[PDB]
Structure formats: C-alpha cells, structure tokens
Design a protein around this ligand. Structure first.
Ligand SMILES: OC[C@H]1O[C@@H](O)[C@H](O)[C@@H](O)[C@@H]1O
Length: 278
C-alpha cells in the first residue's frame, strides 16, 4: 500500500487547501495513502525540516515545492539519493534531480499578468508590486515575467516591490506603506493568492478604487467578490485542485515504472469580471 507525502508552503493557507483536495481525491482513487504535512507558518527552515523528516520515514514518494535553488536543490538530491522519488508541485527546481514537475509555468503567468495590465491601462501606469517573497522561485519568476511584458511600454513604470510573506495582513500593511510613500501609484500587481485581497482592503479604506488598478493571482472566494464589485480588475487563474490531483497520479505512474514527462504545466490565463462565473 503506497505511502506518499505532500508538503505545502503553509498548512492552512487557503490555496494549498485546494491542492490538498485534489491530491486526496487522486489518492483515494488509487488506494494510496496521502499524508499532507507542512509548516503552520511559512518558514524555509521548518520546510526543510519537514522534508528531511518525511524522507527518513520509509515513504515511497515526496511531493513538494522547489522553493529556493540554494536550499531545496541539495535536499531534493538528498532525498533522491535515498531512492525516494520527488515530484515538484506549484514551484519547480528544474536543476534538481526531481523526476517531474506539475505546476504553473510561473514566468509565463507573470508575463500574462503584465500583458493584461498593459491592455487594461492602455500603456499608462505607475505600478507597485506586492510579492510573496523575494527568495521564493515562483515569486521571482512571476515578477520577472511581468517586468519583461511591460518593458516596451514607455508609460509603464514600477516604483516599488514589497514582500507579504503570503498573509492578507502583511499585504495590507505593505499597501499602506507604498501608498503613503508613492501617492502617484495607480496600479497594484500581486503575485500570490492573498496579495490582491490585502491591497483591495486598503484601497477600499481610502476610497481610492477609482484611481487604482488591481491585478492579482488566483481565484480564492474573496478575490471573486472584489472582482465582481470592481475593486480588483483582473486575476491570474491557477489550477490548484488539478495540480494536486495530477501530482499524485504522476507519482503513482513513476513508482509503477511508467515513462512520464518532465514538466506538466497546468493551465493559466487572466480573467476579468466579464469571465465570471466559472
Ligand atoms: O498564498 C500563497 C500561495 O499563492 C499561490 O499563488 C502560489 O502559487 C503558492 O506558491 C503560494 O504559497
């Protein structure tokens, strides 16, 4: 009876709970034991601790983010040398010895965000970026993709980048700080699931909705509420359920000796109020 472990970035984060639903649905489907374990609070040192722990515990396969190249590559290769196969999810480490990746093309998601912002503001924007962190690999890619997409827009300019450590509260905090310091900011870009929600709270508190474009990530309920209301103008779709489901099925194929593709990019697109509901 196969035993796999899935490690989220943070246990009770709303987006990861959707990943867990798809993983446990696939696990039930194959008669597989899925253990979902990860830090209470997103923390790179604990994250590495939960992985090395799960490795020494007889498990048949480990599904995890490849969060940072400097730390997670040695650990993944560590876990591989114990003849335990690793599947990366949501954030890839393409230089490690993980067998396969299931998750968004992160650069492209950020690139599609930049393209939408430039269409919506028609080339004119003073932009602040709220990102989950400056060291997480998917966050960097979503930032770099966005920069690349807007570089040709002479009238788009990025004035600030701050970290939210993927909470609502710290996204709101950073939006209070950016706005006080850059009152000409008329556009926000959030790169993780809770960022546009924190920005939207502050924009609504200041009655700034009419002079602030907000494009964020993912489709958590409150993002859809702000999207229908108007506070948020667009959001980059991800497929957390389907990537939780395909990561498990892909693990089951790997330990069954079957060939599998190295990368499987779940779908990503920018949606607006006109694409609701889904
Ligand atoms: O809320 C934080 C989450 O937001 C999502 O956009 C990302 O794909 C996850 O890596 C991240 O942990």
């Amino acid at each position: 009876a196969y035993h796999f472990v899935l490690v989220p970035e943070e246990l009770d984060n709303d987006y990861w709970r959707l990943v867990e639903k798809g993983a446990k649905a696939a696990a039930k489907e194959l008669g597989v034991d899925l253990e979902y374990i990860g830090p209470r609070q997103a923390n790179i040192d604990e994250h590495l601790r939960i992985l090395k722990k799960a490795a020494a515990a007889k498990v048949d396969g480990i599904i995890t983010q490849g969060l940072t190249e400097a730390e997670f590559v040695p650990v993944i290769n560590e876990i591989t040398d114990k003849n335990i196969p690793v599947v990366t999810i949501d954030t890839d480490a393409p230089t490690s010895r993980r067998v396969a990746y299931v998750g968004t093309d992160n650069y492209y998601a950020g690139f599609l965000a930049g393209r939408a912002l430039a269409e919506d503001t028609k080339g004119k924007a003073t932009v602040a970026i709220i990102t989950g962190s400056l060291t997480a690999a998917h966050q960097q890619l979503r930032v770099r993709g966005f920069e690349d997409a807007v570089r040709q827009e002479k009238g788009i300019r990025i004035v600030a980048i701050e970290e939210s450590h993927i909470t609502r509260v710290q996204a709101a905090e950073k939006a209070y700080t950016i706005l006080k310091k850059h009152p000409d900011v008329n556009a926000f870009y959030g790169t993780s699931a809770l960022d546009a929600i924190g920005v939207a709270k502050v924009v609504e508190q200041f009655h700034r909705e009419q002079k602030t474009y907000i494009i964020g990530f993912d489709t958590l309920p409150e993002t859809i509420r702000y999207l229908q209301k108007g506070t948020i103008a667009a959001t980059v779709v991800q497929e957390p359920y389907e990537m939780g489901y395909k990561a498990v099925k892909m693990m089951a194929e790997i330990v069954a000796g079957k060939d599998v593709p190295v990368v499987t990019n779940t779908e990503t697109k920018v949606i607006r109020k006109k694409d609701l509901p889904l």
